Design a protein around this nucleic acid. Structure first.
Lengths: 159, 159
DNA sequence: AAAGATTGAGATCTCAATCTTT
DNA sequence: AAAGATTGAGATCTCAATCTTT
């Protein structure tokens, strides 16, 4: 039997709040200004960044840190509104590509500045360089920790 | 209305991943070992901590940083499985109390150690004291920033 | 009216089952 | 068989509408 010290509780509690408030603030900013939730927007960003604006489903899920299932549903929804389309992998008749359409790229161009502001104002404008450095070192460890290479691990995109 | 440096962009990414992986890891740990998602478990923890193991709805929402709507739905679900019950406020026939049942308390006693481990292994076991200090200072600013007292704001529990 | 809280519908996420291809 | 990916059902969250009490 362990437990958390009161000091640790304060750290953890303030993490939980912050995260829950950020996701809320950003989801809302994106739902009004761009018509989609934060996770979806992130998918478009990752494709926009990819070679030929495309990425195979599992690779997309891996970057997003979500499950293939969630990704499929999300891309059905994004395909419906025309921001994304799908193609077959030619060498492997099993794979599928998610490709960002022109119109999808135009929604990023239209909305990103808004979304960037919101992410600035909530976070980066409030932290000294030292803490920005410190935040990234910290989250990278937490992330690294939760996606080890070790064999039979429970990674979302391998679910 | 400036741009984000590439460094800042990378910090932000690694934040998003970490958070998305933690919520995933903890939701799953709590869904198997305790039969409920992380946010719900939090509600039980806050009541367990409260005087008389009870708290009025809006107060509960304010601690949890969620909306009243989400809270009502969540407490219907917790009431159904018997971990929570409701009472009327006697002075104000408008208010409602959320009270943690005995059996609900027994689910915390049973599961907390598991949940604490999972939160240790993912986070605290991986950070030096300096970074634990640093994390809390950082998130507390982000949180404080997103819930100002200054009236014309969009706080979940006031939605 | 506004405050406290709930409701139902539709959107999304999770889980398990399924299909095809390797 | 396992890998890549999708489906549908049920669980949960959001949004707007609603009800009761102040």
């Amino acid at each position: 039997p362990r437990w958390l010290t009161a000091e640790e509780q304060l750290v953890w509690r303030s993490y939980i709040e912050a995260a829950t408030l950020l996701e809320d603030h950003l989801d809302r900013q994106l739902q009004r200004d761009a018509g989609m939730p934060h996770v979806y927007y992130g998918l478009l960003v990752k494709l926009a960044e990819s070679p030929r604006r495309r990425l195979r489903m599992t690779e997309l899920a891996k970057y997003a840190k979500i499950t293939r299932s969630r990704l499929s549903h999300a891309v059905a929804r994004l395909e419906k509104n025309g921001w994304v389309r799908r193609e077959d992998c030619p060498s492997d008749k099993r794979g599928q590509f998610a490709i960002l359409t022109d119109e999808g790229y135009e929604v990023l161009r239209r909305t990103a500045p808004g979304h960037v502001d919101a992410v600035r104002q909530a976070v980066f404008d409030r932290l000294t360089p030292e803490q920005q450095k410190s935040l990234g070192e910290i989250m990278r460890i937490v992330a690294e920790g939760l996606q080890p290479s070790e064999a039979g691990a429970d990674l979302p995109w391998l679910r």
